[PDB]
A paper describes a structure:
Inherited missense mutations in the [name] ([name]) gene, within its olfactomedin ([name]) domain, constitute the strongest genetic link to primary open-angle glaucoma via a toxic gain of function, and thus [name] is an attractive precision-medicine target. [name] has no known function, and there is no glaucoma phenotype in [name] knockout mice or in individuals with a homozygous N-terminal truncation mutation or hemizygous deletion of [name], but rare non-synonymous coding mutations lead to toxic intracellular sequestration of misfolded [name]. However, not all mutations in [name] cause glaucoma, and common variants are expected to be neutral polymorphisms. Among the common features associated with pathogenic [name] misfolding, we demonstrate that a single metric, [name] thermal stability, can robustly segregate benign from early-onset disease variants.
Overall, nine variants (T256M, [name], L303I, S313F, V329M, S331L, E352K, A427T, and V499I) were considered likely to be benign. Assessment of spent media from cells expressing each of the 16 full-length [name] variants revealed WT-like secretion for T256M, [name], L303I, S313F, V329M, S331L, T353I, A445V, V449I and K500R. Structural integrity was further confirmed by high-resolution crystal structures, which were solved for 11 [name] variants. No gross changes from WT [name] were detected for the structures of T293K, [name], L303I, V329M, S331L, E352K, T353I, K398R, A445V, V449I or K500R, indicating that these mutations are accommodated within the native five-bladed β-propeller fold and do not perturb the dinuclear calcium-containing site. Interestingly, [name] has one loop comprising residues 261-266 that was difficult to model, perhaps because H296 is smaller and adopts two conformations. In addition to the five variants that we predicted initially to be benign (T293K, T353I, K398R, A445V and K500R), our study reveals seven more (T256M, [name], L303I, V329M, S331L, E352K and V499I) that are indistinguishable from WT [name] across multiple assays. Thus, our data indicate these should also be considered benign.
Numbering used by the authors: 244 to 502
Amino acid sequence: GCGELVWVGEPLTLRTAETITGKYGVWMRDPKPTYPYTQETTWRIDTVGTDVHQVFEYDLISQFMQGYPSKVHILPRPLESTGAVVYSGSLYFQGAESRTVIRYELNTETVKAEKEIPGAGYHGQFPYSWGGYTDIDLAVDEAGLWVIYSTDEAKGAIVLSKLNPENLELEQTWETNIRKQSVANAFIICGTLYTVSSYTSADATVNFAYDTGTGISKTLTIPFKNRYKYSSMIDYNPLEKKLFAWDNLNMVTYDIKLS
Ligand SMILES: [Ca+2]
Ligand code: NA
């Protein structure tokens, strides 16, 4: 059931972090779960600080919302920023102070692939507008795995590449005209990249779209509310067809409607 994004609902708070380590972070579910995980399995990474390596895993939504993790993974190398995703049994994350994407198989705690994103800026060159070293943002949509970034050659405009999820090879690349540091975050739905105008405003918008099928860029005015005024992470989950976000200690989700 694919289509163009036409509406975003009110943010729903699922969990509020209890320490400043959780002011910003990423939380994720797998749109292609694999044993021993299910559609309920939830991963959470608080990303404040300089040696981020703990991943909280919750077998059940009840545990994610009301209780303790069922497992803590200690990543073998530290992680950068809020851009990570989980896809088909692996956490895909960026190595701290690097342009390297790492595929970490969760059930075996094994690194399966590492890839330098060619020419990608990193560590504060092309972050989203809030900073936070958000230069590299992974994404999953109905067609699989992508990475959102920029390069000097693109002069800071958003570049997106489709990734092979097994070995991280780039399969195809598109260059937009949207300055990455001028938008708060971005995500991909049904092959279209969407951006959010502000990470602070209760009256933000989903303000730009780039359709990878046609190469056409559009301006949009879809209301988007940052309930807690500091959104560090905004991603799309194509199985649930919802936005997942992290907003000033709060793990939130937004319903959407496609046309
Ligand atoms: Ca994102
Ligand atoms: Na992401």
